[PDB]
Ligand SMILES: C[C@@H]1NC(=O)N[C@@H]1CCCCCC(=O)O
């Protein structure tokens with residue numbers, strides 16, 4: 070079965086109450102911070118990612134992804150999440166993602182290292 074720069078930049082909110090603050094660069098960079106409303110997390114965490122900086126103009130969304138490692142000055146959950154999805158522009162803009170969250174585990178426990186979920190981001194709370 071296998072601009073965005075202007076549209077992605079700013080603050081987004083997911084269905085869990087988490088907050089994403091991101092700047093999209095002209096050549097595909099995403100940089101910013103993330104504050105999770107759930108899990109072993111407090112305060113903001115560094116976020117970095119990439120997006121398609123020259124997406125198709127045929128009605129398709131804009132592919133992107135980013136990562137947060139859940140370590141900051143306050144806590145370290147020994148885990149990292151990566152969101153993969155697309156930005157869909159317009160009056161009801163969305164970033165629709167699926168997200169993998171991997172914890173450091175022993176080798177014996179590796180089969181239960183990684184969650185899969187889905188987060189939908191909107192520009193209004
Ligand atoms: C991926 C989910 N979407 C989200 O906004 N936060 C969740 C992840 C929280 C993980 C916090 C660190 C931990 O508990 O391991």
Ligand code: NA
Pocket residue numbers: 179180181182183
């Ligand atoms: Na694993």
Ligand code: NI
Pocket residue numbers: 108109146
């Ligand atoms: Ni956790």
